[PDB]
Design a protein around this nucleic acid. Sequence first.
DNA 1: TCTGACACGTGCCTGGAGACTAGGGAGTAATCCCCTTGGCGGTTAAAACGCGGGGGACAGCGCGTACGTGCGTTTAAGCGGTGCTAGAGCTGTCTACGACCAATTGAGCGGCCTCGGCACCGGGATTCTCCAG
DNA 2: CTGGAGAATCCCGGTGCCGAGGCCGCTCAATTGGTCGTAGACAGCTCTAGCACCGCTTAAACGCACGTACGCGCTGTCCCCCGCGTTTTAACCGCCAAGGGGATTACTCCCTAGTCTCCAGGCACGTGTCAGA
Lengths: 98, 87, 102, 87, 78, 82, 93, 92
Amino acid sequence: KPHRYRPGTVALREIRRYQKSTELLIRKLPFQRLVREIAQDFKTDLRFQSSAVMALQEASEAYLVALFEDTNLCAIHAKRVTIMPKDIQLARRIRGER
Amino acid sequence: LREIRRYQKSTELLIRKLPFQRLVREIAQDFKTDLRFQSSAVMALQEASEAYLVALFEDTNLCAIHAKRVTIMPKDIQLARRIRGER
Amino acid sequence: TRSSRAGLQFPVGRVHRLLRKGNYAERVGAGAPVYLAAVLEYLTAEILELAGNAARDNKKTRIIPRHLQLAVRNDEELNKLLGRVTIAQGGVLPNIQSVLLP
Amino acid sequence: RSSRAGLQFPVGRVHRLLRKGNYAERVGAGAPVYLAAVLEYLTAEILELAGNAARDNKKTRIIPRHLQLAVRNDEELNKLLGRVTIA
Amino acid sequence: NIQGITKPAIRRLARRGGVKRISGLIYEETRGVLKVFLENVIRDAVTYTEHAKRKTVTAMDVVYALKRQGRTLYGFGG
Amino acid sequence: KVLRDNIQGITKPAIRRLARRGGVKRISGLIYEETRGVLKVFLENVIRDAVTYTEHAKRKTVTAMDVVYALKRQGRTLYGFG
Amino acid sequence: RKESYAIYVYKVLKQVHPDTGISSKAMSIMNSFVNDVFERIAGEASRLAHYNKRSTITSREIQTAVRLLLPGELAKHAVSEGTKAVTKYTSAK
Amino acid sequence: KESYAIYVYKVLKQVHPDTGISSKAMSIMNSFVNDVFERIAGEASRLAHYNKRSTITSREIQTAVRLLLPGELAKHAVSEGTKAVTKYTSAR
DNA sequence: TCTGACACGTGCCTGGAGACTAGGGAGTAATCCCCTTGGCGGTTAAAACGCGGGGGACAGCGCGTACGTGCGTTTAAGCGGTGCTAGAGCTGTCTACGACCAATTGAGCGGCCTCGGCACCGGGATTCTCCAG
DNA sequence: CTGGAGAATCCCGGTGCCGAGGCCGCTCAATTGGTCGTAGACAGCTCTAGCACCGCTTAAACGCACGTACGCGCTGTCCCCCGCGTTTTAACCGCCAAGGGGATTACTCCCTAGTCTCCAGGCACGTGTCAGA
């Protein structure tokens, strides 16, 4: 009667729902205020775009897609299903930037 | 001294000119009718090849080192070519 | 105009306007704008084909971010030309490995 | 104007390669002056590396062995030059 | 206040990005990764701002920055 | 005029020099030809765009500068050839 | 007013799928895509324009640059659709 | 020699008048300075392009260098580069 | 241990450098305006803490295995030795080609809209799956 | 071991929230032929090397017999980051306004590339020892 799950059914909802549906999920305005607060260290009274911060969420999630996929390949070629410091850092390295 | 100096000190080109020069000629025929008995250009081909082997064997080598191994399986060079985008 | 006279659906005049005002150099390419317009119209036609049909498989007629990225990535060589690009409104791909199964 | 900028490297040669690189028609008021002074700076850095590295073996010459010493011990431009092999 | 970055919601768009498992060590170092990449785009964004004479940055400026950083995004013009 | 089987010109002791220079132990003989396959695809890419380059330059005896442009096309420009 | 590089994209869409809608985000995707592909191809034509050591960029450099960038089936419809389209125009001025 | 030869060994003769070297490493520096050169100049070109400006000068060069390689090396670059520009504005 | 190509100088430039010579783009004043400053109200985005459950990679230990080393070889290449010209850049120019405009003409621009597009309900139908047998 | 309630997940279906669609004169970009403005190959060929030219032993690769020397799997091992769940706290969603510098239009001060004259360090060619092989 409690509708609790199987350990992976949340990740099944991740792959099915979250890999099927592809929409941005975090609210734009507080992160826009974060771009304001981090931007305080540069110059006074800057104006931004809603579309620039939505571009920040888009580049953030696609950035997570690329980091996640090569992080996976670094795990799985080394016979691992979980992600570590060495595979995220090495994953960033093996593009040829580092 | 064997590995570092014998295997690592050599930086000049390693192959006798005429055979692999004919490898350049032979494979070059096999795509467009032709790289020739080129003196310095064929040497640029060998230098390019071995330097590219330095790169793929070095990131391949790092993939080997972190993966608790000191031998090779083809998946490593496949992944290196993947992340560079050779594959 | 010459765009129709080129047997083109795309404006050869406007494409040539991109050439002269693009400033990437006495002339620009002779057949080249017709050439690029033909290729881009072709790959455009197949990507619209993929998003239209694949999106139409869910009764919807426009392109969702899932169908945006999938529509882009379902051509392997276009994926090769766009391997280092970011797709805004894309989300993810159907590349679910068996090791990506929980 | 290069020696009349009091600097070591030519502003007209580097400027001519800027022009024939065909970027825009408006060349800067002092753009090759400043640019040639920056490459005077960092080129002077790698040539001080060339004098010390040449003098590693009582020599006046760096070779690609010494260039692998400097570059494989380099951080700035070896970080900045990734896919580059000194033959 | 970097705590505006809300970590379970960062995990939510990670899941939306397809992320299957996250170790505990991943969070702070990932804050490092977005920290450096994000300081790169706000950094070069500020360089474009200083070269020009605007106080209103654009998403097209982020397109310019990602063009320099090899993660160019469409869907905003340019 | 007819040339066959020169892939061994990329010799095994050279693979010992660079591959054993890499510090990898037990570098298998069952993998060497696959490495030559990686060499095959890479080298046919740079020779590919190289021969398109000198094909545009319409020359029959290719210069090394063409090879420099070929590696340059893949971003793998190296120093010491021009 | 409005501007994009996708009004002809949905024109050719109606040439292929006459009853089909278009999302605005896809219109900007197509606009940014046309400009990106344009700057890449013109970039390679500029690079070969150095390489061939000409002060002239004609269709030869663009076509061979397209031959440089896309391998096989894009090449099929590139020389096919591209070159045949050039054949369709260039019999006259 | 069709290279950066004369200035590299010119200042090398300023540091060591009895110098024996090879043309090959000079070609290495020729590809190096030409390569980084076209990188920076292309960055200034697209730099003026992106911000809808039709001028390329030491601001475009300056910020372009800041994009490709910032840091204290950039601080000395604007130091001797900028003060050098000041000198050329005063002495010719 | 044995010795010769750049330091240095000389033909022979050939590109830096500068002055006319017409020439045009960014800082800034000035007008509407997207939103900054300030105000408003109801609803909610998301997640500490506590309970609940399985879960991650990796070694102990054992199997094991293979190219390198040493030693020897071995023909193409090394090294020495050919010949007329293949071809790269050059030869002068023809041979040939291209922008702006006189003149302006055509679909997006300018100008406004629209009515149903697809988002949101409406009700119903899937669905697969993890806890039941 | 299989197999449905049940919560997550569609499928039309209507209806306009309003955006995909709704639409024509004109204007700004623009088509066509000569003049003005103009860049690369043209066929033939020169001397470095292109293609055709050649003999032997030792050059580095190929191969034989020790010999060594490395990953990888089953099972345990105890490992640990995760998620339900209402509630957690301001943030969220929707509402806005009004002039200010943003965005845009106009003023203003600016506007340096191209050809030729000036000129001098620099390139290929030639000596020679200390740098060079």
